[PDB]
A paper describes a structure:
Like E. coli SEPHS (SelD), but in contrast with its H. sapiens orthologs, trypanosomatid SEPHS2 is not a selenoprotein itself. In this paper, we focused on the trypanosomatid selenophosphate synthetase, a key enzyme in the selenocysteine pathway that is responsible for catalyzing the formation of the biological form of selenium, selenophosphate, for selenocysteine biosynthesis.
We determined the crystal structure of an N-terminally truncated selenophosphate synthetase from L. major (ΔN-LmSEPHS2) consisting of an AIRS-like fold also conserved in E. coli, A. aeolicus and H. sapiens orthologs. ΔN-LmSEPHS2 crystallized as a monomer in the asymmetric unit showing a typical aminoimidazole ribonucleotide synthetase (AIRS)-like fold, which consists of two α+β domains labeled N- and C-terminal AIRS (AIRS and AIRS_C, respectively) ranging from amino acid residues 74 to 190 and 204 to 384, respectively. The N-terminal AIRS domain folds into a six-stranded β-sheet flanked by two α-helices and one 310-helix, while the AIRS_C domain also presents a six-stranded β-sheet that is flanked by seven α-helices and one 310-helix. Similarly, the apo ΔN-LmSEPHS2 crystal structure lacks a 69-amino acid residues-long N-terminal region that includes a glycine-rich loop, where the conserved catalytic residues Cys46 and Lys49 are located. An elongated dimer model of ΔN-LmSEPHS2 was generated using PDBePISA as a likely quaternary structure, stable in solution with a 3230 Å2 buried surface. The dimerization surface occurs mainly between the β2 and β5 strands of adjacent monomers and is also stabilized by hydrophobic interactions between side chains, leading to the formation of an eight-stranded β-barrel. The dimeric structure of ΔN-LmSEPHS2 conserves two symmetrically arranged ATP-binding sites, formed along the interface between AIRS and AIRS-C domains in each monomer. Our dimeric model of LmSEPHS2 contains two equivalent unbound active sites in an open conformation prior to ATP and metal binding, similar to what is observed in the apo E. coli and A. aeolicus SEPHS structures. We showed that the crystallized construct (ΔN-LmSEPHS2) does not complement selenoprotein biosynthesis in SEPHS deficient E. coli WL400(DE3) strain, as expected due to the lack of catalytic residues.
Residue numbers in the entry:
A (entry chain A), B (entry chain A): 6 to 310, 313 to 330
Write the structure that this text describes.
């Protein structure tokens, strides 16, 4: 979800230009600060990528530096976050050209991403979605579980000893956490670049509301305003980190992963296509150019019957695709 | 100070386009929340106006809502800040099209302002400034003093009773505070609109570093990078709220108003012109279109001799223009 603003300028051919901007933030764990920065930047860019815009013109970095650390610790942490944020901006072929850092009792890492585009250079997230369309997800789910288990290694909770220790090893937790953070810092840029090519009908990114929450918002957005559609996103199968699923079952689905509401940070794109043929071709080209990272067809869009505010559903007995 | 980013688009005539963006924030006092919002927005726009860009394409609002207040108080405060912020955006002929609100122990009100412009639609803040140029300031100084005296009426400090009470009345303090907040919520938009018309050589806005701090940064900026100039901004006379000056003298210049380092929020533009004739014409047209708000010629630019990092100075025995 971005802001899309018509400008009082056209391009060289007299075509309308638009300023597309987005902002986001995340609360980092006590962890590798360079990595925090990378995830912070990928999270900001993710929203722009969901508009089918692979080229970001510039970024602003917004950072809250914690008053808890001593000067030495705070200085190196801030420096490393900045470096990691900038490293992802370089990978995105953009630059960080401004922003601000403030002292604050709680840390925060976020920013703003902006692109100036013509209509031909984006894919609008409303107005294209139809019943029958096929849904694909470009990153696996379960990062909230991953981050919390890793946290418990350095600063344990009673739940860790009660339900986790002895059943899921520090090595399996290390591997889950590495898979999750590797996935989180990855850009959705290649996905954005391929959306138009395969006739995508729009996308949303998956962040703090979980797969089902963001699916719901994507569906609900089609019901505003002047030319509404009444649609329901049906999730039939979902890619989830295997160890995150195992951990969830040991903790009575504490983080609501299996319910569809577990928070992701810098999650994947949930993209719609007009057919399975189109969706499969997008997935095939995406894995081939983006380092062999799989994507998954996860369901379809149907006509909405229905309960107020409900525009997405998890199918009863949906398939879990263990990753 | 903004970010100015060349875009891979031209306008209808094949002229280069640039994305100019800026961000800023302020820590609001316990006060009228609608007014907090208005000052917050004017503060964000001020930086864009300093680039001679009177038309803002869009704004994002970034707000930190305090965890200190109870739900009822927080909800109405947040609502009123939002309304005040939006009211100034309407006055600026722009819209707030996105942003974010976060819970936080400390309140903050800020945002982002963006414009897409050609070279002909802005005035760059480096590269035009010359020795001999005349400096003008478009809002009076002393808001930090004003805000703190008003604060002491509802939540007193020992300094208030020691040095203020009995010498500066609650009515004089009310008047100083009203003058200061009236000035702070005013947009620098008309100033921006008139800069090019009179051949301005760039501007900076005046915010948290005080008149001398921002003058210094404006001068120092000319020394980077490929085509540097060595210049010194000389401040010869300064407009200051009369009561703020009186209060300063009672408190041994506590807030450094007389030293030139008192923090302003949403202060005026410090603008350079090639001559006194040009400067006077700008001032005359600005007061005529912007509700009769005075502006002042405050000094000039000279060749820099000098101490490292020093690119501005207050003249010994400079004139205080009481407002």
């Amino acid at each position: 979800d971005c802001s899309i603003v018509p400008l009082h300028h056209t391009n060289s051919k007299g075509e309308a230009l638009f300023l597309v901007s987005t902002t986001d933030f995340f609360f980092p764990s006590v962890s590798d600060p360079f990595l925090q920065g990378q995830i912070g930047a990928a999270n900001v860019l993710s929203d722009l990528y969901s508009m089918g815009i692979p080229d970001c013109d510039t970024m602003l970095m917004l950072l809250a530096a914690s008053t808890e650390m001593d000067e030495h610790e705070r200085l190196i942490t801030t420096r490393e976050i900045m470096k990691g944020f900038a490293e992802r901006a370089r990978l995105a072929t953009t630059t960080v050209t401004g922003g601000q850092t403030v002292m604050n009792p709680w840390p925060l890492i976020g920013g703003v991403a902006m692109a100036v585009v013509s209509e031909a250079e984006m894919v609008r997230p409303t107005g294209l979605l139809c019943a029958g369309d096929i849904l694909v997800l470009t990153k696996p789910l379960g990062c909230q579980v991953a981050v919390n288990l890793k946290q418990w290694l350095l600063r344990p909770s009673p739940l860790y000893e009660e339900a986790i220790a002895g059943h899921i090893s520090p090595e399996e937790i290390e591997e889950l956490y590495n898979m999750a953070t590797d996935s989180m810092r990855r850009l959705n840029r290649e996905g954005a670049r391929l959306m138009r090519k395969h006739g995508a009908h729009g996308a949303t990114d998956v962040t703090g509301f979980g797969i089902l929450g963001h699916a719901n918002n994507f569906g609900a957005a089609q019901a505003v305003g002047d030319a509404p559609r009444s649609l329901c996103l049906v999730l039939e199968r979902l890619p989830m980190f295997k160890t995150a699923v195992a951990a969830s079952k040991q903790m009575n689905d504490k983080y609501r992963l299996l319910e569809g509401y577990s928070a992701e940070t810098s999650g994947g794109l949930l993209v719609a296509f007009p057919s399975t043929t189109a969706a499969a071709a997008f997935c095939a080209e995406l894995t081939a150019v983006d380092g062999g990272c799989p994507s998954w067809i996860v369901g379809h869009v149907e006509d909405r019957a229905a309960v107020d505010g409900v525009y997405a559903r998890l199918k009863d007995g949906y398939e879990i695709v263990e990753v």
